[PDB]
Amino acid sequence: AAQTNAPWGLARISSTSPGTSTYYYDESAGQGSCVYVIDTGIEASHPEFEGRAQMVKTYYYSSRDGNGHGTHCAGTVGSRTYGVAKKTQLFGVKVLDDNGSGQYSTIIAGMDFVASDKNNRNCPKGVVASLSLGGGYSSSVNSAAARLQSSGVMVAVAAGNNNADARNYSPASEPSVCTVGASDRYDRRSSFSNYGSVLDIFGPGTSILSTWIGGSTRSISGTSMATPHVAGLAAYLMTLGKTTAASACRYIADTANKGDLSNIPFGTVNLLAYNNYQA
């Protein structure tokens, strides 16, 4: 399949080269997989989600996304125009209030929620969790993400937007999950992107166009917007049978565009997510 005039990030993840604008992907499109978006919620009613997005859990008075960040990430995972996996199922777990903040205990409860809730969903092609969130190092947050990974969920977490080593951030410093940095359209490390040996992969993170609340769209930047590309890519790859939840991050790193990013600090992987689709 070919989506002309796609957001640059979608075109990048199916290209060996920057600077193109068509997204190429197998039409299976993550059908039969599920991605949990653990964030500020999802505006499920957005026409871009086509009835495929639903809120399954909130820890606050409402389950609606009063922020837009969760809606944006969910749109990059699987919206029809801005999504990597245009046929996946999207499950919203609102662990972040409408200011985008959340206590670690609520975040930890949301991760354990997903690790049990996936047994209530039909995800024959596999389960992914996208965590476009993070704070200071927490062994308890790291262990919650490690449990979620261990439960049979692909966990993808933002590396963080501090332009620092991600070892001091959680869940980015949990080694068993898939820690994602951000790159821009010129194949530069995003200036804000964390780095370090804990990173597994880079995805498009600078000026990412996706869904926004109020049924709108907007372009925003962050490792939190590179993570739903990798999360969406994993659901896509799992639906294609090329990998499993336990090995998705390793697989994505094996098949990534190698050594194509600039301003990647020594000791950090130079790997850019790539669906490796041959039309």
UniProtKB/Swiss-Prot annotation:
<keyword id="KW-0720">Serine protease</keyword>
<feature type="binding site">
    <location>
        <position position="177"/>
    </location>
    <ligand>
        <name>Ca(2+) 1</name>
    </ligand>
</feature>
<feature type="disulfide bond">
    <location>
        <begin position="178"/>
        <end position="249"/>
    </location>
</feature>
<feature type="domain" description="Peptidase S8">
    <location>
        <begin position="7"/>
        <end position="279"/>
    </location>
</feature>
<comment type="function">
    <text>Hydrolyzes keratin at aromatic and hydrophobic residues.</text>
</comment>
<feature type="disulfide bond">
    <location>
        <begin position="34"/>
        <end position="123"/>
    </location>
</feature>
<keyword id="KW-1015">Disulfide bond</keyword>
<feature type="binding site">
    <location>
        <position position="200"/>
    </location>
    <ligand>
        <name>Ca(2+) 1</name>
    </ligand>
</feature>
<dbReference type="GO" id="GO:0005576">
    <property type="term" value="C:extracellular region"/>
</dbReference>
<feature type="binding site">
    <location>
        <position position="260"/>
    </location>
    <ligand>
        <name>Ca(2+) 2</name>
    </ligand>
</feature>
<dbReference type="GO" id="GO:0006508">
    <property type="term" value="P:proteolysis"/>
</dbReference>
<comment type="similarity">
    <text>Belongs to the peptidase S8 family.</text>
</comment>
<keyword id="KW-0645">Protease</keyword>
<keyword id="KW-0106">Calcium</keyword>
<keyword id="KW-0378">Hydrolase</keyword>
<feature type="active site" description="Charge relay system">
    <location>
        <position position="69"/>
    </location>
</feature>
<keyword id="KW-0732">Signal</keyword>
<feature type="active site" description="Charge relay system">
    <location>
        <position position="39"/>
    </location>
</feature>
<feature type="active site" description="Charge relay system">
    <location>
        <position position="224"/>
    </location>
</feature>
<dbReference type="GO" id="GO:0046872">
    <property type="term" value="F:metal ion binding"/>
</dbReference>
<protein>
    <recommendedName>
        <fullName>Proteinase K</fullName>
        <ecNumber>3.4.21.64</ecNumber>
    </recommendedName>
</protein>
<keyword id="KW-0479">Metal-binding</keyword>
<feature type="binding site">
    <location>
        <position position="175"/>
    </location>
    <ligand>
        <name>Ca(2+) 1</name>
    </ligand>
</feature>
<keyword id="KW-0865">Zymogen</keyword>
<dbReference type="GO" id="GO:0004252">
    <property type="term" value="F:serine-type endopeptidase activity"/>
</dbReference>
<feature type="binding site">
    <location>
        <position position="16"/>
    </location>
    <ligand>
        <name>Ca(2+) 2</name>
    </ligand>
</feature>
